[PDB]
Design a protein around this ligand. Structure first.
Ligand SMILES: [Ca+2]
Ligand SMILES: [Mg+2]
Ligand SMILES: [Zn+2]
Length: 223
């Protein structure tokens, strides 16, 4: 996350870190047994770490649970990143508490202008590489589709939306992929892609979760 702040230990209780020997992506806990992340974060051998603040220090509030199965969306296109969403089931149910809570799925889609909270342990430099060990947060608004599409001509689909600042300066970055974009108490997006980080007129692009609620609900109930 570039131009963001340190969230605070366990202030984004639904935030998860996907680990395969090291942190490689973020995710969101939707209930005691399931996590939603981005399909381009699919790996074999995932351990989910909940209650994390510093990913390099076990401070007492963590739960490290291995995944039993992963389901990438049926229509995921790794070339265009369309339908970039995946569900991960936990081998054991997590214990929800103050530090580990699930986030609600949306009932409707959010409007341009809505302020959201984006979080993750990704790179914090646009021009440079600095990986933080504690969770970073960023408040950013949803941009109108017209400004999202002008920035990425022929690349945005109905399953994506942009959020951020066209002036640049603030944005999600690599290492944040799969993480949450929460607006008005609902999970509205998943960190998917962007052009470099925090560049002017290059906002980040997010998977539009309101379009997959039925798929999520049906898939988790049958697995
Ligand atoms: Ca820790
Ligand atoms: Mg981006
Ligand atoms: Zn990525």
């Amino acid at each position: 996350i570039v131009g963001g702040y340190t969230c605070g230990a366990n202030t984004v209780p639904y935030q998860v870190s996907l680990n395969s020997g090291y942190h490689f992506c973020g995710g969101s806990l939707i209930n005691s047994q399931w996590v939603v992340s981005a399909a381009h974060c699919y790996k074999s051998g995932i351990q989910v770490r909940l209650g994390e603040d510093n990913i390099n220090v076990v401070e007492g509030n963590e739960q490290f649970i291995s995944a039993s199965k992963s389901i990438v969306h049926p229509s995921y296109n790794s070339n265009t990143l369309n339908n970039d969403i995946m569900l991960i089931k936990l081998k054991s149910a997590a214990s929800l508490n103050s530090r580990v809570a699930s986030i609600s799925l949306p009932t409707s889609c959010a409007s341009a202008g809505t302020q959201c909270l984006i979080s993750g342990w990704g790179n914090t430099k646009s021009s440079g590489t600095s990986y933080p060990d504690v969770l970073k947060c960023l408040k950013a608004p949803i941009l109108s589709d017209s400004s999202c599409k002008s920035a990425y001509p022929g690349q945005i689909t109905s399953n994506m939306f942009c959020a951020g600042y066209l002036e640049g300066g603030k944005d999600s970055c690599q290492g944040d992929s799969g993480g949450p974009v929460v607006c008005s108490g609902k999970l509205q997006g998943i960190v998917s892609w962007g052009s470099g980080c925090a560049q002017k007129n290059k906002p980040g692009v997010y998977t539009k979760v309101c379009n997959y609620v039925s798929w999520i609900k049906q898939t988790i109930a049958s697995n």
